[PDB]
Amino acid sequence: NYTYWAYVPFPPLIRAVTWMDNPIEVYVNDSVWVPGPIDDRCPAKPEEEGMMINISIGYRYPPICLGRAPGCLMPAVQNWLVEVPTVSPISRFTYHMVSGMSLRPRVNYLQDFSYQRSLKFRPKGKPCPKEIPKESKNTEVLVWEECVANSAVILQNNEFGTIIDWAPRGQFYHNCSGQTQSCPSAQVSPAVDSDLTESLDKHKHKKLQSFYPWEWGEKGISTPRPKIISPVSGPEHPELWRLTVASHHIRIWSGNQTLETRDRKPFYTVDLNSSLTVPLQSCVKPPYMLVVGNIVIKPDSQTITCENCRLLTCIDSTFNWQHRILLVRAREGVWIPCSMDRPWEASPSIHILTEVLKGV
Amino acid sequence: NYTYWAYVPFPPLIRAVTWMDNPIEVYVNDSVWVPGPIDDRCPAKPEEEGMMINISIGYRYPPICLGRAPGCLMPAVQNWLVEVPTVSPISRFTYHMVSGMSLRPRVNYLQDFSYQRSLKFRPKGKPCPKEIPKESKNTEVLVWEECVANSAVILQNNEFGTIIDWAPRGQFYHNCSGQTQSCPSAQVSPAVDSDLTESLDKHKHKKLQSFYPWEWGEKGISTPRPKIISPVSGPEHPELWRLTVASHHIRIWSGNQTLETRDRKPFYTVDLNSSLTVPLQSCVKPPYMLVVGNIVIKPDSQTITCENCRLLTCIDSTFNWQHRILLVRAREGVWIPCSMDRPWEASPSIHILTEVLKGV
Amino acid sequence: NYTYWAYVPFPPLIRAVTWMDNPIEVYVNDSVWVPGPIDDRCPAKPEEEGMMINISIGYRYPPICLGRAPGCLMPAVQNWLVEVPTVSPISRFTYHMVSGMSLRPRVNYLQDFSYQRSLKFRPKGKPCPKEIPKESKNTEVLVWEECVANSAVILQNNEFGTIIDWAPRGQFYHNCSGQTQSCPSAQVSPAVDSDLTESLDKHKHKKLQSFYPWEWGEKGISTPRPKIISPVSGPEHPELWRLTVASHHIRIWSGNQTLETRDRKPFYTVDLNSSLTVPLQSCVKPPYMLVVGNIVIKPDSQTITCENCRLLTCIDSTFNWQHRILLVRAREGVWIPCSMDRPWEASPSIHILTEVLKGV
Amino acid sequence: FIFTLIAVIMGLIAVTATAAVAGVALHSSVQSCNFVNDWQKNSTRLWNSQSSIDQKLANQINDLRQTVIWMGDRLMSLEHRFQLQCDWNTSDFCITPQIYNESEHHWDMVRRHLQGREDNLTLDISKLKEQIFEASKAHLNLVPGTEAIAGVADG
Amino acid sequence: FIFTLIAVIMGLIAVTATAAVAGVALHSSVQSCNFVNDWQKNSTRLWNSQSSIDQKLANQINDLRQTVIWMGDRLMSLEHRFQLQCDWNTSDFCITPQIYNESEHHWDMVRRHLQGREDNLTLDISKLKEQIFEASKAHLNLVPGTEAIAGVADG
Amino acid sequence: FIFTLIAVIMGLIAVTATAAVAGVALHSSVQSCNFVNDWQKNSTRLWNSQSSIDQKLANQINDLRQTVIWMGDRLMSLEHRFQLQCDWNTSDFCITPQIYNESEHHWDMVRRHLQGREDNLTLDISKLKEQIFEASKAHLNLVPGTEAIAGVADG
Ligand SMILES: *[C@@H]1O[C@H](CO)[C@@H](O[C@@H]2O[C@H](CO)[C@@H](O[C@@H]3O[C@H](CO[C@H]4O[C@H](CO)[C@@H](O)[C@H](O)[C@@H]4O)[C@@H](O)[C@H](O[C@H]4O[C@H](CO)[C@@H](O)[C@H](O)[C@@H]4O)[C@@H]3O)[C@H](O)[C@H]2NC(C)=O)[C@H](O)[C@H]1NC(C)=O
Ligand SMILES: *[C@@H]1O[C@H](CO)[C@@H](O[C@@H]2O[C@H](CO)[C@@H](O[C@@H]3O[C@H](CO[C@H]4O[C@H](CO)[C@@H](O)[C@H](O)[C@@H]4O)[C@@H](O)[C@H](O[C@H]4O[C@H](CO)[C@@H](O)[C@H](O)[C@@H]4O)[C@@H]3O)[C@H](O)[C@H]2NC(C)=O)[C@H](O)[C@H]1NC(C)=O
Ligand SMILES: *[C@@H]1O[C@H](CO)[C@@H](O[C@@H]2O[C@H](CO)[C@@H](O[C@@H]3O[C@H](CO[C@H]4O[C@H](CO)[C@@H](O)[C@H](O)[C@@H]4O)[C@@H](O)[C@H](O[C@H]4O[C@H](CO)[C@@H](O)[C@H](O)[C@@H]4O)[C@@H]3O)[C@H](O)[C@H]2NC(C)=O)[C@H](O)[C@H]1NC(C)=O
Ligand SMILES: *[C@@H]1O[C@H](CO[C@@H]2O[C@@H](C)[C@@H](O)[C@@H](O)[C@@H]2O)[C@@H](O[C@@H]2O[C@H](CO)[C@@H](O[C@@H]3O[C@H](CO)[C@@H](O)[C@H](O)[C@@H]3O)[C@H](O)[C@H]2NC(C)=O)[C@H](O)[C@H]1NC(C)=O
Ligand SMILES: *[C@@H]1O[C@H](CO)[C@@H](O[C@@H]2O[C@H](CO)[C@@H](O[C@@H]3O[C@H](CO)[C@@H](O)[C@H](O)[C@@H]3O)[C@H](O)[C@H]2NC(C)=O)[C@H](O)[C@H]1NC(C)=O
Ligand SMILES: *[C@@H]1O[C@H](CO)[C@@H](O[C@@H]2O[C@H](CO)[C@@H](O[C@@H]3O[C@H](CO)[C@@H](O)[C@H](O)[C@@H]3O)[C@H](O)[C@H]2NC(C)=O)[C@H](O)[C@H]1NC(C)=O
Ligand SMILES: *[C@@H]1O[C@H](CO)[C@@H](O[C@@H]2O[C@H](CO)[C@@H](O[C@@H]3O[C@H](CO)[C@@H](O)[C@H](O)[C@@H]3O)[C@H](O)[C@H]2NC(C)=O)[C@H](O)[C@H]1NC(C)=O
Ligand SMILES: *[C@@H]1O[C@H](CO)[C@@H](O[C@@H]2O[C@H](CO)[C@@H](O)[C@H](O)[C@H]2NC(C)=O)[C@H](O)[C@H]1NC(C)=O
Ligand SMILES: *[C@@H]1O[C@H](CO)[C@@H](O[C@@H]2O[C@H](CO)[C@@H](O)[C@H](O)[C@H]2NC(C)=O)[C@H](O)[C@H]1NC(C)=O
Ligand SMILES: *[C@@H]1O[C@H](CO)[C@@H](O[C@@H]2O[C@H](CO)[C@@H](O)[C@H](O)[C@H]2NC(C)=O)[C@H](O)[C@H]1NC(C)=O
Ligand SMILES: *[C@@H]1O[C@H](CO)[C@@H](O[C@@H]2O[C@H](CO)[C@@H](O)[C@H](O)[C@H]2NC(C)=O)[C@H](O)[C@H]1NC(C)=O
Ligand SMILES: *[C@@H]1O[C@H](CO)[C@@H](O[C@@H]2O[C@H](CO)[C@@H](O)[C@H](O)[C@H]2NC(C)=O)[C@H](O)[C@H]1NC(C)=O
Ligand SMILES: *[C@@H]1O[C@H](CO)[C@@H](O)[C@H](O)[C@H]1NC(C)=O
């Protein structure tokens, strides 16, 4: 036998997409509610979605994974609220709200379950607004604008790396400045995970009542832009939220804040109602794919293993979050030794003369 | 005969540039009055400009054509006005104006010949100013800034597609809010097509008189950025106005708005005068070319035909708008079957042995 | 002999980087004090730095050179000052200042050694601030923002070309408007070249006293962005300052402006002190290199010659400004005639038959 | 991706205008490979003789989308060309060993492809490339056939 | 750099999932070149049969960094491929005349390279390429050796 | 377009500095092809041995203009190389069959081209490529001439 080195420029292998990569394109099929890029077509080969595969690969930089496991970012519901001032002695604002699946911040268990925050590596950009504009036209159409928050939330702070996000997160709260300790200093989330899955066809209502006015913050219709800062420094990835939002329906709310006199003192109430949901689809294009299943990441040996897992292109509202998502790409050329039964040859010219002599 | 498939990587064919393409570069030869990119050289082969050709091609997306015919955008004069506040009891403003060949909006024949407007697909960008700045330095140099108008004008709404432009258009008008119906609601264009062609060397004057003050809008020294929205969605093309503006001279005006008492009530007058014009040249570079002639577009079969038409690179003020302009590019490789008199061969090794035996 | 034309795709030659090139990347190893891009690694081949070479090349556009010679930009110290208003009857501001090696403007010898200035080719961008902000949090971290000054400084106005820079330069001065001729109208530089080299480990103090309040201008933490305007027009090069700043330590200052009554009239004093310096390293990456030595540029014949000069990749604080820096890049393919002892051949097929007949 | 060619024999306009007469016959029926060679000869010469990118024009580009997309098509075309097997006697363009059937590909599909159409009556390039890739392997075409080896091995 | 392939026989998902069974054997020991040929056969066919860039998706790209970095890797790979010397009987992929030593490169280095690792126990690609470049020159490999010329020149 | 090479035998600085001694003779007169081969040998080895783009540096790039202009030149150069005809015995660089006239191209034109000049006394590369393209066609050079076929066919 003769074994030689061989170069295969297009191997049928895949590589994991890492946090040191630059952002990739994720296409959604609904321009009304989600910014671009937009594509409403089905996958080019719909019969191939969901094929099973066994995976055992390594990496150099931490892979990008979504789900509930070590090394993957957990999903949760995020709320974006538009506030319109009202000239009336009994009402303060009229509300429009959008709820969707997004990236979950970590929680401070010392405080009242507040988000873990960081001030490291503040980027350049337009600051998030602190005041409601005096006028807002075309409330039905939602305008998404990139925004920089007063502080960054922490998405991961363990041996798999440190991920932070400078996009704002919105919640209901009370000022509690210039007041006594009776003022509650806890934040309230008007929507939870159940509002996106359970009883889609029915009418949903939410009510908040307190003796103090309700404020919303941080403001800004802006989506997460996470990045890694330890042990390596990488660029922002504003496309990851697009994959999570298509895993569930998005819910559209409307409502108001009103005021009435209770116990000889002002009483403030927030009402929100919804009977409308929108289904979405989010896809990546070749040479990018998705690996879905029980992804296991081992940070000590830098190995990714997943047994009996599926290969997909698109995420829709039938996704089960028992599984996890790993972003992959078709790999570059590789070098491999292979064995032949004859020595290496450059041309068949000697070979041709063999049958010429036989033909004489 | 033996007929085989052949690949030609550099065929001498051309492809039409469509509205789904990204913007291309157009070079002007005058930096003082027109923004970049700038190139003042003549075409590399001046002796080849104007060669005649017969064209019969197809397309997939609507082609970009300029002129007066179905499927092409009509040109018209646009006016950009710089206005400076004046502290005087008899004058309101001093004026600087530029008039150039541009893209013509459609006209509402129901109203007083107002422009057809649309609110669809509002882009992101700096809003167009609504108030005159209190001070303006260096009025002699004109600063062009991209701008988003309150509404988009419509350039085409037929079976060839829907083209809209979110850049502002400026006209003279009267504020009729809080007034009677005696105030005219019409809008006046201070310059027309004739001011760019007829009597270039003569002095041009324009006078407007009314009992109501004259306002200019929309403001902003901004050029058209048209795009297609139906039946396909494509990017903006801010370079198309550069080709039209070179087909005529541009005219520079100056003037003022003054006030005097007539019939015991204020009387407002606008004076503009001009004795200066600037000739320009606009060019595209290879692999892009221009097809000029009687271009015919058939939307049912998606065919472009043009008999006895010229191939050009540059547009100057000697252009005749009896003809139309089609943007084209050199085509990519093509596949063609051709016939040989012998079977396909990989090497001449067998051929070489033929004369070796003959040479023995 | 037979001499044929040959093409060498990767010759071991170099080309000079000119002002018509687009900006290249320069990596610094300190994210705290200098913006990105950041790389703290040593050169890949540290044993090759400083190899000697003789150079004799031509050019088409003026080369980019730094140092003290015809055709090269001279370095000098630039100061960036942060001002924080203080509410106190005896003090005006608290100060933070950074001093580093930068590009030197030309000097008007007619005036009180003021900078030569130009108003040509004003770029688009955010104007430089004219007023001190009332809210400046996190003064310890310095935020660098691109800025457009009221006027451009001139860096070169000779037969080698005209280089101008629209970035601001800051100095101490008095208003001297509404005052008498006794008001000094000269600008003062709080730091000089000696403050970066002499007595690094010692304490540095600077004091300014006058009967008129001290103002700083132009404001803005913005680095030079020079460009060529004559006889050719090229893009800005905001990376050249990164190479100069690493040739010396950068000095960090702090201080205040205070007020006291002297001779029954207000007396204003500026105090600055420093006991901290930071060393830096700046590098370029292959295929870019640096040529360091006695670089000579001849504009009449467009030749660059340098005898016994070193090749480098990184600049640090041990650099001697007796030498100069020329930016170079590995060259593209070239055409060269070479001679063979036999005629040109396409295949060895005839050669192979020669030993076949001999082997019979 | 942008060049200024002053000293070339023919410009892009002359190459396109002069080849149009012969392009009429190419659109109507199958021609000989010599006919195709004369038609594309000056176009291939023009695109093999540009020297360097015009730096004066290149450094003024603001939006890179159209340039990058153009470069991606050129890179893909070069990759496919490196894999093709071509007849030895023609070097301006590649002639593959794939025989034209004319029962799978009626001439109207070829004419529509030459005109720049991509409708459902046009020749499918992706399907055609798959056939050529499988039929052009070296172990099937590099060694001359029996009828050629026997003909030359007469003694 | 982005294509929509509708009429191809196999998509990227099927190509990746079907080859995974044979990839287990490739990760364990040295296989024959025929075995490697079958493993990569459908992947090479897919990447030689795309027609044109999907313009609908390409014109919507906002950040070009990831696209440009991908194109740079492809351009570098094509440059190195143009310089390699390959066995005549295999055209899908290049077999170099460099003999595998197995004393310098233990199989564990090869397995780590196939898995996508770049640690200090992985095969050094840059060092391997330098060895192959110096050992594959035309004046050392194009002319068949004496044992081959003598064997065929028996009369 | 940006790499970090740690384990290569020679860096870019050493390749440039070591070859400068021989470059003096190349600037003065015509040398043999063996001389040119030795002069460029280590430079060609360096540019065939880089492994992958340094991702730590590449993802920090803000302005892509210089990188795209560099890639466009490399793509154009690769396209022209794929069309050239080269002598079989030299594979590091391409030797064309175009005979050097020395009456059309005085040596001073060649020296100015090697120095990187583009004035009116410099060799015109575009005109030279057109001349080489027309003279290097396969039907004119692949078949050896009569004096070579007759010499080997002595019996
Ligand atoms: C972007 O891409 C996503 C991909 O998911 C599309 O989402 C799909 O949207 C369609 C249209 O809205 C949805 O279809 C609708 O589903 C409902 C019925 O199915 C439910 O109920 C039955 C039993 O009744 C169950 O078997 C089933 O599992 C579902 O729970 C109804 O809301 C709709 O019915 C309407 O149409 C049918 C047929 O025409 C009529 O009979 C009805 O009277 C009624 O009019 C409808 O069928 C679909 O479920 C979504 N797919 C999901 C969520 O995975 C987006 O539409 C697409 N967006 C754009 C803009 O292209
Ligand atoms: C960008 O590129 C455009 C290309 O169109 C250039 O435009 C040309 O500019 C030149 C210079 O301004 C113009 O030439 C001028 O034309 C006029 C004379 O020609 C007219 O009149 C005669 C009879 O008098 C007719 O025969 C002829 O057909 C024309 O109708 C005059 O305005 C000028 O004359 C001046 O120069 C001549 C010669 O030096 C003197 O004799 C005169 O006394 C006088 O000084 C001049 O010749 C030319 O017409 C333009 N071309 C057009 C419009 O197509 C731009 O200049 C260029 N810009 C930059 C910045 O490079
Ligand atoms: C970016 O890259 C630059 C590359 O220049 C790095 O700069 C180097 O930084 C180090 C660490 O600060 C400097 O080393 C320090 O130098 C001083 C001593 O050297 C001087 O004095 C001796 C004699 O006393 C002379 O021989 C010598 O020439 C110098 O004049 C001291 O400040 C420091 O000493 C400290 O460490 C030593 C050893 O650990 C202890 O003995 C001391 O007690 C003390 O703790 C130190 O050695 C080095 O000089 C810099 N190089 C230069 C200026 O060229 C940057 O650090 C790097 N930045 C980052 C963020 O990576
Ligand atoms: C080597 O090159 C020489 C010179 O080439 C000429 O000068 C260069 C500097 C460039 O400008 C070239 O483009 C230019 O051709 C060639 O000699 C030339 O040969 C031609 C063809 O035989 C001669 O043309 C003829 O000359 C006379 C007088 O006009 C008449 O017989 C004909 O009408 C015809 O024009 C030409 O004069 C001659 N030039 C010189 C300067 O001697 C030479 O052929 C070439 N060697 C080759 C190709 O092997
Ligand atoms: C491709 O380019 C070549 C030139 O490189 C073109 O060949 C040229 O064709 C013209 C027109 O037929 C020839 O002109 C002829 O000259 C004389 C009179 O001077 C006479 O024979 C004819 O009346 C005619 O005018 C020209 O000589 C010839 N040039 C050559 C052969 O070098 C060719 O036509 C081009 N082909 C295409 C398809 O573009
Ligand atoms: C690469 O793609 C080819 C097809 O282009 C694959 O070959 C195909 O393999 C399948 C599975 O073995 C064959 O199906 C077989 O068909 C019959 C019943 O119809 C029977 O023999 C088996 O039960 C099996 O189902 C299919 O015919 C065959 N297609 C061919 C030869 O054209 C090949 O497996 C792929 N290889 C890789 C590594 O991806
Ligand atoms: C291209 O690179 C090669 C190496 O890959 C260079 O060859 C090397 O040249 C040096 C200097 O002549 C040789 O050193 C010699 O070593 C011994 C003593 O140790 C003695 O023969 C001499 O005194 C000399 O110092 C070195 O061995 C040699 N390396 C080899 C042959 O592998 C070559 O010079 C480079 N050429 C260019 C143009 O850059
Ligand atoms: C929340 O409830 C309000 C109030 O009922 C809904 O708004 C009304 O919707 C009905 C049904 O289309 C309309 O006829 C009314 O004109 C709407 N306005 C009012 C003041 O009654 C609203 O649609 C609900 N929001 C959501 C998201 O379902
Ligand atoms: C474009 O096509 C027209 C129409 O066929 C050509 O004009 C005819 O040319 C023929 C051939 O010389 C003449 O016999 C006719 O008299 C011409 N005129 C007609 C039919 O009206 C024309 O030459 C073609 N143009 C180009 C540039 O090739
Ligand atoms: C046109 O008229 C409108 C309506 O009066 C002007 O807007 C008003 O501007 C005055 C300025 O004193 C304000 O007091 C009003 O509150 C404005 N009204 C509204 C509804 O906004 C507008 O400025 C005028 N435009 C021009 C160009 O003169
Ligand atoms: C419009 O007319 C004004 C007023 O005549 C012109 O401005 C004068 O131009 C002359 C001729 O150069 C100068 O001497 C005067 O100083 C200018 N000012 C005044 C107040 O008279 C103006 O140039 C004309 N505008 C155009 C565009 O031709
Ligand atoms: C300039 O001098 C001030 C005043 O001494 C320094 O600030 C003090 O630094 C010391 C030493 O760390 C601290 O203990 C003090 O708290 C600081 N403040 C005061 C008010 O004393 C300052 O560090 C010096 N600046 C530089 C750049 O060296
Ligand atoms: C082969 O093609 C030629 C033209 O190239 C034609 O003249 C000849 O008739 C053909 N032979 C046939 C059809 O047998």
Give resolution in angstroms: 2.2
* CB-based contact B289:D16 (threshold 8 Å): yes
The conformation of residue C148, written as its DSSP 8-state character, comes to B
Distance separating alpha carbons of residues F103 and C260, to the nearest angstrom: 86
Find the B64 Cα to ligand 9 centroid distance in Å. Answer: 27
The amino acid occupying position B16 is A
- Looking at the CA of residue B339, tell me the nearest atom of ligand 13: 5
DSSP state letters, A225-269: -EEEEESS-----TTHHHHHHTTS-EEEEEEEEEEEEETTEEEEE
3-state SS assignment for residue C254: strand
Largest CA distance in chain D: 70
Q: Least CB-CB distance to B352: which of C124, C233, C349?
A: C349
- Looking at the CA of residue B28, tell me the nearest atom of ligand 2: 1
Find the B279 Cα to ligand 2 centroid distance in Å. Answer: 8
D66 lines ligand 5 (CB under 6 A): no
Tokens 């001139």 correspond to: C154
Question: What kind and span of H or E run contains F138?
Answer: helix F138-141
Is residue B11 in a domain?
A: no
Closest CA to B237 of C38, D65, D103: D65
3-state helix, strand, coil in chain F (%, to 5): 50, 5, 45
**Burial letters C70-109, b for 16+ CB under 10 A, else e:** ebbbbbebbbbbbbeeeeeeeebbbbbbbbbbbbbbbeee
- Taking the CA of residue F2 and the nearest CA in chain C, the distance in Å comes to 7
Is residue C209 in a domain?
A: yes
DSSP state letters, A85-147: E---SSEEEEEEEEEEEEEPPPEETTTTSEEPEE-SSPPPSPBPP-S--S-----SS------
C40 lines ligand 3 (CB under 6 A): yes
Q: Least CB-CB distance to A349: which of B124, B233, B349?
A: B349
Closest CA to C75 of C206, C246, C190, C228: C246
* CB-based contact D118:D110 (threshold 8 Å): no
DSSP state letters, F42-100: HHHHHTT---S--HHHHTT----HHHHHHHHHHHHHHHHHTT----TT--SSEEEEEEP
Q: Least CB-CB distance to F56: which of A20, A22, A332?
A: A20
Tokens 């291309």 correspond to: B24
DSSP state letters, E69-111: HHHHHHHHHHHHHTT----TT--SSEEEEEEP-SSSS-HHHHH
Distance separating alpha carbons of residues C163 and D11, to the nearest angstrom: 37
Distance separating alpha carbons of residues A164 and A155, to the nearest angstrom: 6
Tokens 């001002």 correspond to: C83
Tokens 């020595």 correspond to: A343
Distances (CA, A) of D36 to A272, B287, D12, D94: 72, 22, 19, 11
The amino acid occupying position F147 is E
Is residue B174 in a domain?
A: yes
3-state SS assignment for residue C202: coil
B69 lines ligand 11 (CB under 6 A): no
| Neighbouring C-alpha atoms within 13 Å toward the C-beta of A246 | 20
Find the A246 Cα to ligand 1 centroid distance in Å. Answer: 14
- Taking the CA of residue A357 and the nearest CA in chain D, the distance in Å comes to 7
* CB-based contact E14:A288 (threshold 8 Å): no
Phi-psi region of A271 (alpha: psi -120 to 50; beta: other; left: phi over 0): beta
Distance separating alpha carbons of residues C167 and C164, to the nearest angstrom: 9
Is residue A348 in a domain?
A: no
Distance separating alpha carbons of residues D113 and D122, to the nearest angstrom: 6
Distance separating alpha carbons of residues A221 and A357, to the nearest angstrom: 82
How many domains is chain B built from?
1
- Which residues of chain F does D48 touch, with a Cβ-Cβ cutoff of 8 Å? 79-80, 83, 129, 133
Cβ–Cβ gap F48/E129 under 8 Å: yes
- Which residues of chain B does F144 touch, with a Cβ-Cβ cutoff of 8 Å? 352
B182 lines ligand 13 (CB under 6 A): no
- Looking at the CA of residue C316, tell me the nearest atom of ligand 3: 5
Distance separating alpha carbons of residues E66 and A20, to the nearest angstrom: 11
* CB-based contact C47:F11 (threshold 8 Å): no
Tokens 């806890």 correspond to: A186
Ligand of minimum distance to the alpha carbon of B219:
10
Q: Does B338 touch chain D (CB under 8 A)?
A: yes
CA C92 to chain centre: 33
Q: Which residue of C has its CA nearest to E149?
A: C356
Cβ–Cβ gap C232/D59 under 8 Å: no
C245 lines ligand 3 (CB under 6 A): no
List, as ranges, residues 187-206 from B with C-beta within 8 Å of C: none
Structure tokens at B11: 């065929």
Is residue B325 in a domain?
A: no
What contacts 24+ positions apart, CB below 8 Å, involve B122-130? Answer: B122/B148, B122/B152, B122/B166, B123/B148, B123/B166, B123/B236, B124/A145, B124/B148, B128/B168, B128/B218, B128/B219, B128/B220, B128/B222, B129/B219, B129/B220, B130/B217, B130/B219
The conformation of residue A321, written as its DSSP 8-state character, comes to T
Cβ–Cβ gap C353/B356 under 8 Å: yes
Beta bridge partners of B100: B78
Q: Which residues contact F87 (CB under 8 A, 6 or more apart)?
A: C4, C340, C344, C345, C346, F94, F95, F97
Closest CA to A51 of E15, E115, E23: E15
Distances (CA, A) of B210 to B68, B93, B259, B266, D113: 35, 16, 10, 9, 62
How many Cβ atoms from other residues are within 10 Å of residue B129's Cβ?
Answer: 14
F8 lines ligand 7 (CB under 6 A): no
Distance separating alpha carbons of residues A47 and E11, to the nearest angstrom: 10
3-state SS assignment for residue B135: coil
- Which residues of chain D does A348 touch, with a Cβ-Cβ cutoff of 8 Å? 142-143
Is residue A231 in a domain?
A: yes
3-state helix, strand, coil in chain D (%, to 5): 55, 5, 40
Find the E90 Cα to ligand 6 centroid distance in Å. Answer: 22
Structure tokens at E60: 């919507």
Closest CA to C83 of C192, C170, C188: C170
The residue count for chain A: 360
CA A92 to chain centre: 33
Q: Does B16 touch chain D (CB under 8 A)?
A: yes
Which residue minimizes the CA distance to atom 12 of ligand 7? F18
Tokens 């992101």 correspond to: B124
Count of pairs with CB atoms under 8 A, one residue in B, one in D: 200
- Which residues of chain A does C38 touch, with a Cβ-Cβ cutoff of 8 Å? 233
Distance separating alpha carbons of residues C155 and C64, to the nearest angstrom: 13
Q: Which residues contact B226 (CB under 8 A, 6 or more apart)?
A: B73, B103, B155, B163, B164, B165, B236, B237, B240
Closest CA to B26 of B353, B289, B296, B222: B289
* CB-based contact A193:A237 (threshold 8 Å): no
CA C277 to chain centre: 19
Where does residue D141 rank: exposed (0-12), middle (13-18), buried (19+ CB within 10 A)?
A: middle
* CB-based contact B167:B225 (threshold 8 Å): yes
Is residue C286 in a domain?
A: no
Q: Which residue of B has its CA nearest to C233?
A: B38
Structure tokens at B63: 């082609």
Q: Least CB-CB distance to C349: which of A124, A233, A349?
A: A349
Phi then psi dihedrals of residue E152, to 5 deg: -85, -25
- Which residues of chain C does E153 touch, with a Cβ-Cβ cutoff of 8 Å? 355-360
Phi-psi region of C121 (alpha: psi -120 to 50; beta: other; left: phi over 0): left
B1 lines ligand 13 (CB under 6 A): yes
B51 lines ligand 9 (CB under 6 A): no
Q: Which residues contact A66 (CB under 8 A, 6 or more apart)?
A: A72, A73, A75, A240, A243, A244, A324, A325
Is residue B343 in a domain?
A: no
Please tell me the experimental approach by which this structure was elucidated: cryo-EM
Range(s) of the domain holding residue B28: 18-47+63-281
* CB-based contact A195:A77 (threshold 8 Å): yes
Cβ–Cβ gap E66/A354 under 8 Å: no
Q: Does C87 touch chain E (CB under 8 A)?
A: no
* Chains contacting A (3+ CB pairs below 8 angstroms): B, C, D, E, F
Distance separating alpha carbons of residues A48 and E17, to the nearest angstrom: 10
Ligand of minimum distance to the alpha carbon of A28:
1
Q: Does A87 touch chain B (CB under 8 A)?
A: no
